[PDB]
């Protein structure tokens, strides 16, 4: 059967590992969010086409610019993530992640995933950011970024609400098929 290997990348503390666990486990981790996410593989059907979706996390390597790209080769789709409530992780999409992934993978589709959706309209979160003269990233902004880097799709999700997860991986697979 056809395999699609998906590599999730992006700033640390963005939700990557949680997101991948929440998805593959169909349940938010809870109070204790595991640190390790072993390489995942499962059969998935999308638009009638059957595929073996492979998922690789990248936690712990975001700061090692020469080790980080060792997972890039032979990748079919990249999920460049960023926290909706973290303007900095957002800016890294254009300053760090996109340029890097594109350099190593000229022809690989990129889904721009926005995470921590559920914290976007959270009073405490919004105030915390306000205290730092900051504001969450809005859908229109995420979409523009996605358009700027030429992403195939711009999705948003919440490993907590588990909303948007399935979409994220299905669109990922479509981007390949």
């Amino acid at each position: 059967m056809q395999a699609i290997k998906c590599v999730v990348v992006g700033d640390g503390a963005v939700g990557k590992t949680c997101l991948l666990i929440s998805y593959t486990t169909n349940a938010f981790p809870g109070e204790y969010i595991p640190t390790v996410f072993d390489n995942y593989s499962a059969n998935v059907m999308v638009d009638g086409k059957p595929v073996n979706l492979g998922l690789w996390d990248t936690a712990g390597q975001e700061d090692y610019d020469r080790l980080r790209p060792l997972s890039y080769p032979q990748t079919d789709v990249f999920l460049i993530c960023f926290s909706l409530v973290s303007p900095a992780s957002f800016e890294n999409v254009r300053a760090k992640w996109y340029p890097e992934v594109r350099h190593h993978c000229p022809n690989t589709p990129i889904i721009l995933v926005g995470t921590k959706l559920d914290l976007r309209d959270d009073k405490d979160t919004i105030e915390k950011l306000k205290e730092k003269k900051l504001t969450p990233i809005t859908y229109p902004q995420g979409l523009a970024m996605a358009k700027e880097i030429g992403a195939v799709k711009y999705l948003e999700c919440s490993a907590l609400t588990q909303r948007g997860l399935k979409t994220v991986f299905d669109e990922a697979i479509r981007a390949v098929l």
Partner: peptide, 28 residues
């Protein structure tokens, strides 16, 4: 099992992933 997570490429990347996980577990 015809499982990607079981292909040769999936094993040969594990070492590189494992060391870099350690500091994360420790910080917790």
């Amino acid at each position: 099992r015809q499982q990607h997570s079981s292909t040769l490429e999936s094993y040969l990347i594990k070492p590189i992933q494992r060391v870099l996980k350690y500091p994360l577990l420790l910080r917790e």
